[PDB]
Structures are given as structure tokens and as C-alpha cells.
Symmetry: none
Subunit: 271 residues, 2 copies
């Protein structure tokens, strides 16, 4: 007992494809050590990383299937004491990614003394298990080089896709904004919060930080290079009042599926 | 003694590549006339250009190596009485480019009566030595046509990458902003400052002003045009109070390497 710096099981570069539809009954089968609700704890070593992976969700059951298929194996290989949480937005009104992420943080803590949080879109898979889904000395940007972006960071302050913050780092910035409702920029806002609290972004190199975007059918088109939203005055101004401390929502239901926990919640409408 | 208008040693178009790793011991060897700390003064003619080259720096030792390897010989070929300063951000908070540049200006003057300042990123190399690293009648934008931007200027008000200002011109604008803690637009702010102080931008032409960006391995893919942030009103507002006259920092260490001067500084956190 006492986990090693790096993990022995690391396979490094991996093959990621989406032409092979999958069955969750299968992933369950292939990932036996994974207890109810998507929980897994190393049975040999003692991991210092209690990670809760939060996934903003809404009508992406297919993406979720591929996501679970790839990540569960990877995560156990990284020797992580982790849990999976799918925060499902109940309405049919604007999607609110950031807010669902805040909800995950709060809900997950009701289950375990997690000290680390990975916020991941369902449609992203890491192509190299050296890209550890854990927290670092500074906030982590994991999805650094994405196939949909020519494997190139859109700009240095891009903090979208997959990231990780320790409980401390997360609290430090008052969580994430709840007021971006799918208008875009919340991830730029979150980056602003980090700078204001004197933190910076820790990243893996562009080689191991390569990631695939779940897009079956033959899609090779390179998604338009995203721009940065300039709302720096706005973050400094609203940061302390929009976030964890202003977070309100109703848990409509909680389902402990074999491979993950699914929390359906009502988070409101915008105004 | 008494230098000439255009240097005789000018080679013109040059070949710039980064597939051949370099050793600084070699650059020392190949640039013998370069005194401690990266200082060089023409031994024949008398140069009117006392130029301090300032480089914002942090964990880019490799780029520095290529930068030194190409620039040192180009500078001497331009017959500049110059010195190299790498300003190293000691923190682990958001990188503050412009602030480090201000520190360079102040620290370099403690060494020599420089009357000209070139501010350059480590990762840029000029592809034609007719693009003199000196000051002009108006502020100079040197890196005019960069390979990764398809050798075209991103926009007429782009003033990023490599530029030069006389002490007077720099002083005139109260140096550079110190408050842009990584969210960008600082170079747009600087351009604004110049407009406000009755100056305009001077540029070498597209051809002689071509530059390469240090990108080894094979990141041959064309880069996204740099984003222009609107800060006009903000600059009018804050220019006089944010800059040289508000500059605070602690010099943690000064190292006189053979090919350059390295000053590690603590420049604080954001607020
Ligand atoms: O109706 C929606 C909209 C978005 N998302 C999810 O929320 C995140 C972001 O989605 P979009 O912006 O398309 O994702 P991308 O630009 O990668 O960002 C991912 O979990 C995505 O699959 C949903 O689950 N349902
Ligand atoms: O962590 C960092 C970030 C930036 N820089 C320096 O800051 C400048 C700007 O870097 P980025 O915008 O990537 O610059 P480029 O794409 O030229 O743009 C460079 O001189 C570089 O030396 C560092 O030293 N460390």
C-alpha cells in the first residue's frame, strides 16, 4: 500500500476509434473491478488522488457509451480512486454547462471525500494514458491538443474541453459561473477567475495531451478555430457573486448505474 | 571611427531552420567578440545605436538557444552597441509579458546608457538582416511578416512580437501596462498608448520584414491570426497610472551568462 509516482500499467499512445458501436453491458463485463455508480479504488496501492469526474450531460447517451468504454480502463490504469458523475440537465431550455459542473462538485462531495475534480465534456477522449486525470500544483488543462483542432491549442488561455482542479483550487475561485447559459465564454471566464486568484494553467505537452473528439461517420473537417471571449472586466466584477455561493438547483433524481452515477437536476431558465 | 548609415556586413535574406539542435558553448565559440552578459560594441565604427534587447522569459530555455544562435551574429552585422536581457518571471502565477518588459527597461539602464530598446519574444527570428534591431523616428514594429501567419500582418494596428522604442518614446507612453496578467490585449494597449501620445508606427516592408517562429519537430501548420482586443477607452483611462510610474517588483537574482544577462524577478500577483 502507497501508490507510485507514475503508474506501471501505463500503455502510452493508444488507438481511439468510434466506428465500432458499443454495449455498456460489455464495458461492465470488461471492467469488473468497477463498483456501483462508476466507483473504483486501487486494490493494491493507496492512491492520493480521490478524483470525481464530472460530465455535463443532456441527450448524449451515445457519446457517454464511447466515453465510458475508453475512460474506465484508462483511469484504473492511472491508479485513481475515482467516481463518475453524469449531471443531466432536466429541461429543454438553454444548456448551462458551467452550472451543471458546479452541481457535480456539490453532489459528488455528498458521496466521498474527493479532493480532486475533473470536468470533462462527454465527447472527448485522451489518446495517451500519460495524460493523467488527476489534479496538479496549478489548475490542469487536459484536453490540450484535440483532433478537431488540428491537434493545436486554439490560444494559450483556452481552458475548454477537459480540465482538473483540486477542491482547494475550485473553492478558491468560487466555483464556476452559473450565468453563462450557452451563450459561450464560461470557459474563458473560468480562466479569468484563475488569473485573478493568482493561479496559472498547468498542461501536459502537446504529444501526450492529444485527444479525440467523438465524431462517428467519417468526419475529418477541422472545426473553425474558436475565438476568445473578452469579458475580463465582467469576471473581476461578478466572480465573487456568481458561483458556488450563489448556486441553486433541485435534484430531480439520482440513479446509481453500474458504470456511473446519473443526477438529473432542474437548474432553471435564464433571465 | 563614426559608423555608417547602412552596414557593409549585411547579408540580406537568410536561411532560418530549427531542425539542428544547438549548444550555447558553440554560440559562444562562434561569437567571440561578445563580452560577458551578452554585450557587444563595434570595434571599428562608432555606433549611435545603444540598444538593449529585452526578452520576456519563463521556461523557454530551448527557444533562447535558437534565438541567441541566430540573433547575436545578426546584431553585430548591423553594427549595434547592444546587450541582451532575458527577464525571467519567478512566480507560478499568470505570465505577465508587458510587465517583465518594463522591468527589463529599468534594469538594463542600471548597466548602460542605452537609448534604444527592442522588445522581442524568444520565439521570433528575423529572416533578413536589413530589418535592423534599432530605433527609428517613430516606434518600430519589426516582426512584420511572420511565417506562421502566412507572412502577412494580422492587422495594421498589430504591434506584437518584436518592436523597438527609443528611451524617449518609451518614457513618453509611461512604458507598458503592468496589469495585463495573461489575458492578452497588452500589445493592443501599447499600440493605443502610442496613438494617444501623437506617435505612429513605423515598419520595414513585407519582404525585408519577414520572420520565422521557432517551431521544431514539424508543426508546419499555419497559425491562427492573433486576436485584436478592444481597449481603446481603457487605455485612455489607465495609461498614466499603469506603467513605469506604477512599476513594482523584486529582483531575485542577476546572472551574467556569457551570451546574455538573466534577471529573475518576482513581479507579484493580480488585483
Ligand atoms: O444539448 C446539449 C449540449 C451540450 N452537451 C454537452 O455539454 C458539453 C459541451 O457541448 P457543446 O459545446 O457541443 O460541446 P463542444 O463545443 O466540445 O464544446 C459536452 O458534454 C456536450 O456533449 C450536452 O450534453 N447536451
Ligand atoms: O509561460 C510562458 C508564456 C510565454 N512566455 C514568453 O512570452 C512571449 C509570448 O508567448 P505566446 O503568446 O505564445 O507568444 P507567441 O505565439 O510569439 O505568441 C514569448 O517571448 C515567450 O518567451 C514565456 O516565457 N513563458
Amino acid at each position: 500500500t502507497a501508490c507510485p509516482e507514475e503508474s506501471p500499467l501505463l500503455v502510452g499512445p493508444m488507438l481511439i476509434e468510434f466506428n465500432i458501436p458499443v454495449d455498456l453491458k460489455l464495458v461492465e463485463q470488461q471492467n469488473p473491478k468497477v463498483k456501483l455508480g462508476g466507483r473504483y479504488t486501487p486494490m493494491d496501492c493507496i492512491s492520493p488522488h480521490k478524483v470525481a469526474i464530472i460530465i455535463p450531460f443532456r441527450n448524449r447517451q451515445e457519446h457517454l457509451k464511447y466515453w465510458l468504454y475508453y475512460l474506465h480502463p484508462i483511469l484504473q490504469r492511472q491508479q485513481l480512486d475515482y467516481g463518475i458523475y453524469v449531471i443531466n440537465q432536466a429541461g429543454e431550455s438553454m444548456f448551462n454547462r458551467a452550472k451543471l459542473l458546479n452541481v457535480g462538485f456539490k453532489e459528488a462531495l455528498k458521496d466521498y471525500d474527493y479532493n480532486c475534480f475533473v470536468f470533462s465534456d462527454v465527447d472527448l477522449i485522451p489518446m495517451n494514458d500519460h495524460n493523467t486525470y488527476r489534479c496538479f500544483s496549478q489548475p490542469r488543462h487536459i484536453s490540450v491538443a484535440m483532433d478537431k483542432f488540428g491537434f493545436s491549442l486554439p490560444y494559450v488561455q483556452y481552458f475548454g474541453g477537459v480540465s482538473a482542479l483540486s477542491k482547494q483550487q475550485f473553492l478558491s475561485i468560487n466555483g464556476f459561473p452559473n450565468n453563462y447559459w450557452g451563450w459561450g465564454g464560461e470557459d474563458d471566464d473560468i480562466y479569468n477567475r484563475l488569473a485573478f486568484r493568482g493561479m496559472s494553467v498547468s498542461r501536459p505537452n502537446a504529444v501526450i495531451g492529444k485527444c479525440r473528439m467523438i465524431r462517428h461517420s467519417r468526419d475529418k473537417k477541422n472545426e473553425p478555430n474558436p475565438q476568445r471571449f473578452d469579458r475580463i472586466a465582467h469576471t473581476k466584477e461578478t466572480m465573487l457573486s456568481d458561483g458556488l455561493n450563489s448556486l441553486t438547483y433541485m435534484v430531480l433524481e439520482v440513479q446509481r448505474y453500474p458504470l456511473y452515477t446519473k443526477i438529473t437536476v432542474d437548474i432553471g431558465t435564464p433571465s
